[PDB]
Amino acid sequence: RAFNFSAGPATLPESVLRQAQAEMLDWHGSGASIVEMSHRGAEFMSVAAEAEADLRRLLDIPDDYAVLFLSGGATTQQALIPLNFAAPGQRADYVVSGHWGKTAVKQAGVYVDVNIAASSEANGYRELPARADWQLSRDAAYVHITANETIHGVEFRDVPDTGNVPLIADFSSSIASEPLDVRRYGVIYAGAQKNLGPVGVAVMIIRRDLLERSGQPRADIFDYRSHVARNTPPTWNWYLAGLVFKWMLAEGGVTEFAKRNAAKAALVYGAIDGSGGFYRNEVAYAARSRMNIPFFLPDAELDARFVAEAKAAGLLALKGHKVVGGIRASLYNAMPLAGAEALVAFMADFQQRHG
Amino acid sequence: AFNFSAGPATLPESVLRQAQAEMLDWHGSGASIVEMSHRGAEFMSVAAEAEADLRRLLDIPDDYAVLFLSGGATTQQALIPLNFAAPGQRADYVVSGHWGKTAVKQAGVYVDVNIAASSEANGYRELPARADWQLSRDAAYVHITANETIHGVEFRDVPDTGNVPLIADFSSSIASEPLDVRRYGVIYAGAQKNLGPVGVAVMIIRRDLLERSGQPRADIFDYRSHVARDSMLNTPPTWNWYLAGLVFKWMLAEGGVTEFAKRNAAKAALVYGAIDGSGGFYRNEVAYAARSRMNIPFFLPDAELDARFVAEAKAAGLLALKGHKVVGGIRASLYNAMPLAGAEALVAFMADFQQRHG
Numbered sequence A: 001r002a003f004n005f006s007a008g009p010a011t012l013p014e015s016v017l018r019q020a021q022a023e024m025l026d027w028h029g030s031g032a033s034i035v036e037m038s039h040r041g042a043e044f045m046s047v048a049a050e051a052e053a054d055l056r057r058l059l060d061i062p063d064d065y066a067v068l069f070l071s072g073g074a075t076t077q078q079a080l081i082p083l084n085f086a087a088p089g090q091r092a093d094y095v096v097s098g099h100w101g102k103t104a105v106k107q108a109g110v111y112v113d114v115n116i117a118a119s120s121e122a123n124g125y126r127e128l129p130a131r132a133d134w135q136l137s138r139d140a141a142y143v144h145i146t147a148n149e150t151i152h153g154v155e156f157r158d159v160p161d162t163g164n165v166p167l168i169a170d171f172s173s174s175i176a177s178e179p180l181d182v183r184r185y186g187v188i189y190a191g192a193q194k195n196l197g198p199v200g201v202a203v204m205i206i207r208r209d210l211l212e213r214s215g216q217p218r219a220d221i222f223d224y225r226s227h228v229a230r231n232t233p234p235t236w237n238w239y240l241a242g243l244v245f246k247w248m249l250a251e252g253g254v255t256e257f258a259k260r261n262a263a264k265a266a267l268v269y270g271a272i273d274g275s276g277g278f279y280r281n282e283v284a285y286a287a288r289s290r291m292n293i294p295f296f297l298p299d300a301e302l303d304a305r306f307v308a309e310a311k312a313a314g315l316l317a318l319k320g321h322k323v324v325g326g327i328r329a330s331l332y333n334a335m336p337l338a339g340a341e342a343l344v345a346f347m348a349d350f351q352q353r354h355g
Numbered sequence B: 001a002f003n004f005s006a007g008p009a010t011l012p013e014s015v016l017r018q019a020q021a022e023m024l025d026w027h028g029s030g031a032s033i034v035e036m037s038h039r040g041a042e043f044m045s046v047a048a049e050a051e052a053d054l055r056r057l058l059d060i061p062d063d064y065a066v067l068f069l070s071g072g073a074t075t076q077q078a079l080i081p082l083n084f085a086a087p088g089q090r091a092d093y094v095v096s097g098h099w100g101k102t103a104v105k106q107a108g109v110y111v112d113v114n115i116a117a118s119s120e121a122n123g124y125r126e127l128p129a130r131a132d133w134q135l136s137r138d139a140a141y142v143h144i145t146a147n148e149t150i151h152g153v154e155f156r157d158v159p160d161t162g163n164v165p166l167i168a169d170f171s172s173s174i175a176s177e178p179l180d181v182r183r184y185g186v187i188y189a190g191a192q193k194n195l196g197p198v199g200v201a202v203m204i205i206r207r208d209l210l211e212r213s214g215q216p217r218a219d220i221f222d223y224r225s226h227v228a229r230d231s232m233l234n235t236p237p238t239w240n241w242y243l244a245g246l247v248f249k250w251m252l253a254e255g256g257v258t259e260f261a262k263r264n265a266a267k268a269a270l271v272y273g274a275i276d277g278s279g280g281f282y283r284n285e286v287a288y289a290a291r292s293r294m295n296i297p298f299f300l301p302d303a304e305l306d307a308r309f310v311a312e313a314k315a316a317g318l319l320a321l322k323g324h325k326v327v328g329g330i331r332a333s334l335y336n337a338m339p340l341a342g343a344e345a346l347v348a349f350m351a352d353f354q355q356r357h358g
C-alpha cells in the first residue's frame, strides 16, 4: 500500500473519501449534493447535529461544554481566544514548547499581556519545560499550552495543574488520539487537516462558564457567545468532518486509537533507538510525541536519500519541516499500524544498504 | 427542475460532475485535492490558476491584490475597518438592505459609523437622492452593498465618493457583468450567491490601501500579511479554493462577464416584463433604475395567493421561490448559473397562474 506520513494534511481513511465521492451528487439517495444544501434546511441540520453528537460521544464531552465548528483554522482561534476570554490587557500565561505555541503567542500579544510562563526554546524545543519551573500568574485569564508540537515532536503526557486558572490547549495534532478528560480544560481546540476535522473544519470545545466573561470589544462575528447562541464551515466540509467522526467511532473510538497510536510510535522509536545511532531522535523520552516523530540520519545527504527511496517504496511525505531538517514521520489516527510496520522495515533495509 | 434559491445558489452541473470525477484523481494524478498540501507544487499550481482566471474574468489590473479567504462576507465586514481605518475613524455606510445592516453591525465597534444614506425607514423601498447623501470628508471609506438579495435593489452605477475609497459587497452580483475594478478601493464577495456554494470568499484590494496602518490587530487579521503570503498565511480551505477555481473556469468557458451581462439582462427583462405587464397582479415597487437583475421579489394580491404561487410553482418544477421571511411574497433569484430557460419557465408559469387565479 501507499502510506502517507504527511504532517498536514493528515491521511484520510480511504472508505471516508470513497463515500464522499460516491454520494457527492446524491446524498443518502436524496438526489442532491451536500455541497448545495442549505445550512438551515432539515437535511443539513441533521448532518450538523450528528457531527456534534458524534464528536461529543467520541471525546465524552459533557453538556456543560459547548462545541463549535469553525472556519479560519487554529490561528484564527488563537486571536479570538484572548478577545473572548480575557479583559483588555489582562495577563495570560503561555507555555511555549514549539513552533505552534510561538504562533499562538504571536496572535495574542496585541490583545493581552502575554506572559511566557515557561519555554523550551533555548534548548531548541527538545523537551517540555519542567512544570516545577513554570512561572504562573495568579490573575491570568488562562494558561495556554500546545498539547502536541507537530514540528518538534514534543508532547504533554500529563494534564498540568494550573490552580483555578482555566487551561486552554491546542490539540490540533493529537485530539482524539487517546482519551481526553475534557472536564480538566477550559478550552480545547483543533485546526483542520491534522488529526480530527478535515479541510476547512476547526473544532472548539468550550467550558460554558467561560462564555460568561466580558472579553474585549469585538465584532459579533468574533464573539463565541454569538456563535453558541445560533462562521461555520461549508456544508460539504462539515459533512466530511462528520464522516471522519463516524469512522473514528466505528474503529473503536479513542480507546482503540490510544492503543494503535501507542503501538505505532513504540515501533518507530524502537527502530530509532535500536539503530546504533544511525537514526537519531533528540527529544527527551518523557516528551516524545506519539503523533509526529522527527529523526535524523548521519547527514543531510542521507536524509534526502531516505526521503526519496522511501517515496519510491510507497512511503510518502517524510521530509522534515524546514525549521528542523531531517525526517518526520507523522502517525495520525488514519495511519494504520501496518504503515508504521512498513516504515520500520524500510528503515532496517535502508540502513543495511547505506549504514 | 429550476432552483431559484437566493442562497445557496444553483451550481453548474458540469462543475459538480468534474469535482466528483477527479476527487480522488486530480488531473489523472491519482491524488485527491482534499489531501494536497497547500504549499506543494500541485496545489500551488491550482491557486495560481484560480487567481489568474479571476484576474482574466474581471479584468483585474496588476495594481490590485487578490485574496481568497475563509470566514465569509461577515468576517470581512469586521476585518475591513480593522485594516483600512484608524481606530475610531469615521467610516461611511450606505444601507440599501439587510446585508448593509449586517456590515454596519460588524464595523460599529471599530469605527465611527456614519449612515450616509439609508432606505430602512420605508422598508428599504427607495434610497435618498445622491445629493442628499451625508458623506464625510474624513471617512476611511464608503461602504455599499452592490446588490441586496431580500429587497431586490442593485446599484446599476458606481457612486462618486471623491477621494474616499469605495468598498463594495458584491456577494450576490460579482462577475454578473463587466466591472471597472479601478473605480473601487475594495471589491469583495462571500460564497453562496453569485459564486455558488464554493466555500471561499474573494477580495480585490487596490494595493495602495495596504499602505494604511489600520488598527492594532493579530497577524491573522492583517490583509497585508495575507497578501504577503499569497492567501496562505495559515492553512487555507484547499478543496473550496479548487471549487471556486472550477467556477471561474466555467464562467470563462461560457464566454466571460460580457456573456453573463447579456444573459442576466435577458433573464431579468423577461421576469420584470411579466411583472410590469400584469396589471398590478404581480407587484414590485422598486424604482426601475434600482431593480436588481439577480434577485427579483414580487407580491401577489394577497398572502394567500403568494402561498398558492409558491406551491403551484414547486409542483411545476420551479423551486425555492418563497420570499425571505422578513418580507414575504415571492423571490426569483437569477444567478449566473441559472439559464435563460429557467426565466422562460418562470414567466410561462406566471402567465398561466394569472390566467387561472387572476
Ligand SMILES: *Cc1c(COP(=O)(O)O)cnc(C)c1O
Pocket (backbone or CB within 6 Å): A008, A072, A073, A074, A075, A076, A100, A146, A148, A149, A150, A170, A171, A172, A173, A191, A192, A194, B234, B235
Ligand atoms: C498544523 C497546526 C496548526 C495550524 O494552524 P492553522 O491556523 O490551522 O493553519 C496549529 N496548531 C498546531 C498544533 C498544528 O499542528
Ligand SMILES: [Ca+2]
Pocket (backbone or CB within 6 Å): A108, A109, A110, A111, A112, A113, A114
Ligand atoms: Ca500585550
Ligand SMILES: [Cl-]
Pocket (backbone or CB within 6 Å): A234, A235, B191, B192, B196, B197, B198, B199, B200
Ligand atoms: Cl459555501
